[PDB]
Amino acid sequence: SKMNLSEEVDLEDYVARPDKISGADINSICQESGMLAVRENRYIVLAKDFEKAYKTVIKKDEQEHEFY
């Protein structure tokens, strides 16, 4: 929201999928991912930009189903 709706982000981008990662991703990484909407091929940001932002600089940690 700081960058007004990620500089006019599209509707079909919601963070519900790329936030419920349980992969740390400190607020600094969150700000970096927000600024990784710098893909200026278009004037709007899509869910692909967020997916690439989460894909870069990340460590694979998963498997909560055993604990639950």
Place this chain on the structure above:
Amino acid sequence: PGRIDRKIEFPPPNEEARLDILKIHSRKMNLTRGINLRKIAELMPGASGAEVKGVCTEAGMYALRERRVHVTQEDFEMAVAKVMQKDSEKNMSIK
């Protein structure tokens, strides 16, 4: 040698000791006319003089948000709640 002279130990303060520490720490501060500091200290289970200091400063901070010179018994009991937040967390109670 260097320790065989004495081995004096510190008993944790009793309810009346916690009284006396409440009186020592609250003589400097201002509060309401009426307060049952004896029951206030007894309400705290065990604890120590550091916890009495924590209760006194918690009462001061609680009275700060209301901005009055007379710390009320309700604010004191809110300060007694500083003895809480430790408890035993989960009811282990295994003994």
Place this chain on the structure above:
Amino acid sequence: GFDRHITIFSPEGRLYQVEYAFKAINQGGLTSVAVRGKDCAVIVTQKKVPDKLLDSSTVTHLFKITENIGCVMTGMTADSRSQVQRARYEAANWKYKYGYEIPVDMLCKRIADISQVYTQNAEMRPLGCCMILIGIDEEQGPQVYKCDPAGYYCGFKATAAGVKQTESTSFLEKKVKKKFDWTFEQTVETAITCLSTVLSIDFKPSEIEVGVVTVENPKFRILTEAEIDAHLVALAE
């Protein structure tokens, strides 16, 4: 220490041995996809065959546990075969003790209980193989379940396991969120395109082995080369 060496609870309040055993499934270099459909349930895994001196006839990772339940294994092949043998024994023993055939959910529950006994105690170790078993169940339609080296047995509609399981699960989540039921053409094509998008080799109809259980046709059909080739031709059309 030995918190991370034996099956004991960590001081932080975790179980590291099973956490490692799950990554053991990713080890081995394989992926599998399971898609439940409107009426059928189809599963497909790649068939990584290094050199042709092997017998592609017997390199498979999918098996018939009983006449209506088919499993696909992911992870170390020795533990995979051990758990397949255990599942077949459980299915036969259930059919002997109780007249009706063992429901797939009950079979997955028993396998998960065995795995939970394995993660219990300290003499043995958990088996590094995650099993996805499917089968048609009356009054339930197709049914898909996953038992893991921990003992948590669940999984439905679209579920994947292997190295690149997360990407496949994401694509299948997109597909299932797209509200349209898959017939006995769309379910297979969806699974095939999911695994192909995960690992783009365009899937020459020899490197995957698909198992199918429909409702009008029961039994675990291990679809032949001709059937997978026909489905691939229809999809890439």
Place this chain on the structure above:
Amino acid sequence: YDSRTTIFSPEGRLYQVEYAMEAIGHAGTCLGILANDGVLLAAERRNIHKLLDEVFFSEKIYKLNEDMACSVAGITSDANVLTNELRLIAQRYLLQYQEPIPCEQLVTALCDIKQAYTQFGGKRPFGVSLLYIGWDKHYGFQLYQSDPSGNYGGWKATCIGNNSAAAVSMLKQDYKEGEMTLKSALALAIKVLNKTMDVSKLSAEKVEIATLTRENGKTVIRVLKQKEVEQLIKKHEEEEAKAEREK
């Protein structure tokens, strides 16, 4: 491979058993006082969270036999199994001899099982010490205290809880044998419990007490309910007020 510690010390000490016995002092608080025509136990209710319902009707005091009752002060996991084994031993004796089991024999059996647990195998010592009050044909009212070391002792006024030293000092100061009766024993027990529990004016809910009395050829083990306990508290409070004011 990991191996347990059921071994000695370079000096020759069983420091695992010693640590367990000291840990028994930590957590829990029970005391038994023996008097003529009645023996009683007093227990400190540790957790008094308002969200409980108190339906087990007893947590520390356990009825173990027709003619006896115990009170644990160790880890509840071992306490439950130890109470079950104690009841089983008592009832096995009752089956074998068709006669209530003498208290000393029961305590010796239990301490034998605890000595076995600390003696052989890679098994933890039973981290629990419990009192016993009971009546028999040979010795009448008896009180026994057994520690996790398995070395029981035949007491007449003792405490086993956290401030067990303070409680036993208070008992020694204000204990009088022979003259002691059931009512004066109740007064002494409530007084020592008030001493060992820092909060004065103890609520009847935080204290659980059970008295064993000898009716006409029959042993009655009555746990004193809330109203009777708080009436005892009121009588004690009257005594305290009179004694303090008369100076």
Place this chain on the structure above:
Amino acid sequence: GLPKNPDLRIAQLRFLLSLPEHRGDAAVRDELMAAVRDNNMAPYYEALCKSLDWQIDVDLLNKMKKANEDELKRLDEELEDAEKNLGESEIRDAMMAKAEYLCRIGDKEGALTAFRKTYDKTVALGHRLDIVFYLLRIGLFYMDNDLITRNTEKAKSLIEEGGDWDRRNRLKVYQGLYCVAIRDFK
């Protein structure tokens, strides 16, 4: 600090009845409604100028004043004779009760005497602040600009220097001196 505020109201009502003769019908009504209450006989030497010399409540009202003042005087005599409480003791608040009786009931002269007495007696921070506040309030009551200036001078000079977060409780009436005077500009 609530006392002397309803006194301020009656002082303003006396102003409205006295200075503007246009308000000579409703002003009489409000003056009477707030003077038959509040025990206005000692604070009626000022009220006699506008209305009659004394309203028709003389017997009952004077009996109430004398009885109340005598009871407080008896209480003060007991504290100052039977008990030797000195300095930091309850005699300080006993004389505050004396001053409150002499102010809210009696005339300003006895209240001022009791105030100046305990001001010279005890110089504690809280006691000194309270009495300075009372002196300011009674001064702005009876329109003694000399007393208002005196208490304002001492408060702003030394009294408010010792003790904080109470100047915020006092400037609203400490600047009333400028408010009542011409200096309403800066």
Place this chain on the structure above:
Amino acid sequence: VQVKEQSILELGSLLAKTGQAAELGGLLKYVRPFLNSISKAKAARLVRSLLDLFLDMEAATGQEVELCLECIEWAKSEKRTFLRQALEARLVSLYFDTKRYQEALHLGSQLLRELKKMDDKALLVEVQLLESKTYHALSNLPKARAALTSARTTANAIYCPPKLQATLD
């Protein structure tokens, strides 16, 4: 046995559709035995729905406040604290709708004092938002900003209140 309350809901729906006021008021004053015979939450929400439907269309400004105050007093007599708190929040909203100056403010303050000791969240967010709204109506910008910031701090709890999130934004 619950078909009667279904009929009450059905009657209230038709009264709202037609626009009736006196009949709906009489029904609300009549259903009180049935309210004190069922689940507290279900009866409370039925009362809230009926009251909101009554206050929707027919603008009897001299009767709406009095009727709802009577309902609050009735709820207090029935010791339904969460019901009476909900109607207090509703009258804070109605007060803001009718441009009430400060009686809305102290009612909101009373609600906040009663509710912060509890741990309700939806009511707190609505109360704080209404307090921000009336500060803005009275042009109390800094206190509105402080109340709105507290509204955000409280509103973090509810994850998908699709109406409420739009109200905050």
Place this chain on the structure above:
Amino acid sequence: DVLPPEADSSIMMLTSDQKPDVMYADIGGMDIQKQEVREAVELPLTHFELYKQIGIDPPRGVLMYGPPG
């Protein structure tokens, strides 16, 4: 002579005041606690007078032993 300025002697940042970079409530971290931090700003937010009279001793140091989170 004595040089008045002290900050730029070794740089090490300077007066970051009088400049809104990230105001306050605009932070995404909400609180974490932020109540001990508002407690820490009580001394800058005047209240040194209220530190006395009431008798409290306001904190002087605040150490935050957290990761870049």
Place this chain on the structure above:
Amino acid sequence: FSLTTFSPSGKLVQIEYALAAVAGGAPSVGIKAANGVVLATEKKQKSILYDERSVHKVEPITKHIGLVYSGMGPDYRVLVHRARKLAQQYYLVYQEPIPTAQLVQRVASVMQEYTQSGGVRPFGVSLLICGWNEGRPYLFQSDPSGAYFAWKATAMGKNYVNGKTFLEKRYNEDLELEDAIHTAILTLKESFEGQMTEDNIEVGICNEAGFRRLTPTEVKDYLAAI
């Protein structure tokens, strides 16, 4: 060694780690009302791929004994299977007592094979039990090492502390009717991150008529008007 073990001087370190593990993240609140008991829990499945009618968090051990749990679901399965076998054995031995609440205390006590024989690694699940075949309800909690606690209202999730605080502040109380399930859902709401729905929230109720796991229809009905 091969039992509940690892007890140093004055501590049960392995048990304490098991309790750190049962902190979990499934709140699984329980409320003992006058008419009966409500055990409500949160089923927050990862993604929509998983199913909610496939696996359950609430299990009816017998006719009117219901069970909810905490972290380590695989352990909870074995524990509930053992509990079912134990209750069935008791009912077979003492034939036809319709044993639920005169058995709820007994089944809670026989939850000693639960932990007092830990099995090298102790169980990592704490479970709440409800029964109402005595004319009165019963809510008990068994933890990875302790025993019956006989709660009136509690939670065993990631935010169980503030959940229990909510329960006491909202006055679990004693006159509350059977429909304190609204308060249980509210307590879950505090420890819930999302728009909870019928499949997202699983709740079972045990009243004097028996025990029943509420279907998504009634769960959604209760979740409506909240």
